[PDB]
């Protein structure tokens, strides 16, 4: 009855989870304070300055030694993640567990790594990195700032996550006392921030698509832009859809579509014959090839 | 007139207050201006029901000159402008700004 | 409104808009904006002067 019920009803969901959206920051590397800076209160007063005493969150790490490390989705505000991540610890730790995917389990010690199987483990970790980054860069509400440090452009206010707002736009820093951070941030170009352009199709509606600049690494950006490119590849116009449905019913039940603006639809519902052939063959390989298997079919 | 005088590229109106500092208003910013003017009028003349709200609640408040039109299948467009008649409050208001 | 503290007993300096530290003493012109963002320092290093 299980097989028969399975073969008879296709409305059993179990479809691949295609639509995943991120409203946070399209980055996978986190700037990290590794070695904290010392607090001086008797001698050498004034050599260091913390943004804490100004009630401000520094846009950059301010420890004695700072590092760039790979941490997937560390700023991923929004939808729930794919469910697999890559989180390297700072280089002051082992960071070996990230390379024991294969050929390690019963063989090497807990505190080692397999030097003879390095290539495979590295490849798999990169694969996990890639899969974890497959999201859609969703837009979010923009707004102008009425403060003094405005640049004339609107920015993306991360309501409920103010620390994101501080991190997103290093250009909006407030700089006293010319520290090494200040000596760099002071060179920031004024208007390289916030919304750059948008596609405003319907009056009073949310922009269908927007272009802006913010904190975002190139590699993750390249990944996600490919991901949407893939999604577009499996989408067709409603006219195609209705024609396909009509044909499937041997031109019985000839329905049609309304004619009006459909601004930002997306129907990833199609593929190529080669994929269909591939899946068909693969499905046959999965099942047994005896008379007891084709009978429910 | 009020919205036009706060976006320094907008619909053409005399601008006596341009000497004052003002960041150029976005679509959202102008809505607040539209609301305040709306409320002030309804308070002054004691009016119930909508008077000007649609301009603030939907679409871009940065209006220039209202117009309605219909499109014929033959590609012909029939458009009817509705330029307002001579206002009186606007004149004295501009005078108040100038002085 | 960045100031530049200096070691070895040299008294501090202020960043000219040409991006060159200058001595505090003398004459200065403050746009409203820089004051609004650097009042905390101004209250401690310029105002006393």
């Amino acid at each position: 009855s299980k097989h028969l019920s399975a073969y008879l009803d296709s409305a059993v969901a179990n479809g691949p989870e295609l639509i995943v959206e991120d409203t946070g920051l399209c980055t996978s590397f986190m700037l990290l304070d590794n070695i904290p800076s010392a607090h001086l209160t008797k001698e050498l007063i004034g050599f260091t300055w913390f943004m804490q005493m100004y009630q401000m969150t520094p846009p950059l790490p301010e420890g004695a030694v700072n590092r760039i490390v790979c941490m997937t989705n560390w700023a991923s505000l929004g939808d729930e993640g794919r469910g697999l991540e890559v989180r390297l610890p700072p280089p002051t730790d082992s960071s070996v567990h990230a390379y024991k995917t294969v050929l390690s389990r019963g063989y090497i010690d807990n505190a080692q790594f397999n030097p003879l199987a390095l290539r495979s483990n590295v490849l798999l970790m990169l694969l996990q990195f890639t899969l974890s980054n497959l999201k859609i860069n969703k837009s979010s509400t923009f707004t102008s700032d009425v403060t003094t440090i405005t640049s004339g452009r609107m920015i993306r206010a991360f309501e409920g996550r103010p620390e994101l707002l501080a991190l997103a736009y290093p250009g909006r820093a407030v700089l006293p006392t010319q520290t090494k951070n200040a000596q760099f941030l002071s060179t920031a170009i004024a208007d390289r921030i916030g919304r750059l352009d948008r596609a405003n199709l319907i009056g009073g509606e949310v922009s269908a698509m927007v272009e802006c600049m913010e904190l975002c690494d190139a590699l993750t950006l390249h990944i996600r832009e490919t991901y949407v490119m893939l999604l577009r590849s499996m989408h067709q116009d409603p006219t195609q859809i209705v024609q396909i449905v009509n044909e499937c019913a041997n031109n019985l039940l000839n329905s049609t579509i309304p004619i009006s603006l459909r601004p930002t639809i997306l129907c990833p519902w199609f593929a190529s014959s080669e994929d269909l052939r591939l899946q068909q063959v693969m499905h046959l390989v999965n099942i047994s090839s005896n008379t007891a298997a084709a009978l429910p079919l | 007139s009020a919205v036009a005088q706060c976006q320094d590229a907008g619909f053409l109106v005399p601008r006596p207050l341009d000497a004052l500092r003002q960041f150029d208003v976005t679509s959202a910013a102008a809505a607040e201006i539209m609301h305040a003017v709306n409320d002030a009028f309804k308070t002054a003349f004691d009016l119930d029901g909508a008077l000007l709200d649609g301009l603030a609640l939907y679409g871009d408040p940065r209006i220039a000159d209202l117009s309605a039109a219909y499109l014929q299948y033959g590609g012909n467009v029939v458009r009817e402008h509705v330029p307002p008649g001579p206002s009186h409050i606007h004149r004295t208001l501009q005078q108040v700004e100038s002085t | 409104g960045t100031i530049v503290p200096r070691p070895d007993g040299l008294e501090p300096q202020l960043i000219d808009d040409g991006n060159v530290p200058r001595d505090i003493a003398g004459d200065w012109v403050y746009p409203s904006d820089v004051l609004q963002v650097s009042v905390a320092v101004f209250c401690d290093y310029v105002w006393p002067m």
Binding site: Q55, T143, I155, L165 | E32, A36, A40 | C43, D44, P48
Partner: peptide, 30 residues
């Protein structure tokens, strides 16, 4: 009374996010 209305939350959020302290206690203040 005079008319006022609150700004939109997004405006307020950004404004409140940037408010450095007016007076800061440091040992070197002339």
């Amino acid at each position: 009374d005079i008319i006022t209305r609150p700004t939109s939350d997004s405006i307020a959020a950004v404004a409140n996010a940037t408010k450095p302290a007016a007076v800061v206690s440091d040992p070197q203040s002339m």
